[PDB]
Symmetry: C2
Subunit: 234 residues, 2 copies
């Protein structure tokens, strides 16, 4: 059965071959495809990409910062408007795991003063069946070179944390994109990364029994068997 | 190049083979898979499914009703809170086609009194490149037997209408799902539908030049070459 990372690499390859030139809001060039999806199993493994070294310390540390609600993304997750979207997701999983509305949303803070009721930007929908927690992240745009590998890890990590406190096993992480794009300057680096064969994904271990989302600390987590290709600067 | 309808049929086949039993909020049984996506070209054809007759008159007539903002889904599109989400999408396409925030959202009206800031339920994100308009619909759940074939047509139709008034050509419709499910009682009908070979999709023609979204009427639209298999009652 194929390595999950082959989806990301096939997606990079598709945008290079078929993506269209499209500028971003600074007028910086990208190659763009609209509408992408990939699924990474979280069962006995953790989708920290291996065709380049992903900055796991920054993934974990930033997620713990967001969860703290400190300032921005974490403020919205915990003080929406506030509504604690994150605790509500946890409480809903616990009171009605069948629920089709287990959804948390985030806004780009630059959008907030720009117009009335701006669209969100990213949503996470959680799903429970057979004691497994899955998560689907929809982002309205994804920087395939820099942001996407880091976000696969962050939201996979979030799903592990929530599965842990709700007593569920991690299931799948599904990453859905609107404008999936590669910045022009990342094209040569990505072409080299596409030459690299994925290695088996590592595992993530939680070293302690933790009861509340806010009680996790960086030392509670341990990545085992992470043996990536070298760092690619983008 | 494969018939777009093969995605839907492959998805039905996947849920029957691999879907898990999961109840809905009435306690009615389904087979469920979390996270699905399909892409239907809108270029010189229209994705009105052919392995069963889709109720096109009801698709068009209901969409025109939603667009009227009459009461519910249309009220939210046009009087959000209001904010006219639909006109804002049109105006944004016209003033900044590169924008990554061309998003309109809809809520299940039963959710509105149930809690503070309920999650949406469905979002449509629009995308423009090379004078083509694409649309991605994300629904938190999709009834694969009844709702999905009807919604592929409705949102494909909406994309045609918006492409028409903004002077763009229709591109792709991308349908993304959270809980994609088949109701237990639709399983035998769907198995029979899976035996049927798709025919070439019809075309949709707009018979008049229309300038404002509100000026369309049912007679402005004409489906040509629709030659589906017989009706399946679900």
């Amino acid at each position: 059965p194929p390595h999950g990372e082959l989806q990301y690499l096939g997606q990079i390859q598709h945008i290079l071959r078929c993506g269209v030139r499209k500028d971003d809001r600074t007028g910086t060039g990208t190659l763009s495809v609209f509408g992408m999806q990939a699924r990474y199993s979280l069962r006995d493994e953790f989708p920290l990409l291996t065709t380049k070294r992903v900055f796991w310390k920054g993934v974990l540390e930033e997620l713990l910062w967001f969860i703290k609600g400190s300032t921005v993304y974490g403020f919205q997750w915990r003080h929406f408007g506030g509504v604690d979207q994150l605790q509500r997701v946890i409480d809903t999983i616990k009171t009605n795991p069948d629920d089709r509305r287990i959804i948390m949303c985030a806004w780009n803070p630059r959008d907030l003063p720009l117009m009335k009721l701006p669209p969100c930007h990213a949503l996470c929908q959680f799903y429970v069946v057979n004691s497994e927690l899955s998560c689907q992240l929809y982002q309205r745009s994804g920087d395939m070179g820099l942001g996407v590998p880091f976000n696969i890890a962050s939201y996979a990590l979030l799903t592990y944390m929530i599965a842990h406190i709700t007593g569920l096993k991690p299931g799948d992480f599904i990453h859905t994109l609107g404008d999936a794009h590669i910045y022009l300057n990342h094209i040569e680096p990505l072409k080299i990364q596409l030459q690299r064969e994925p290695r088996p994904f590592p595992k993530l271990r939680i070293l302690r029994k933790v009861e509340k989302i806010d009680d996790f600390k960086a030392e509670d987590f341990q990545i085992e068997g992470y043996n990536p290709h070298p760092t690619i600067k983008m």
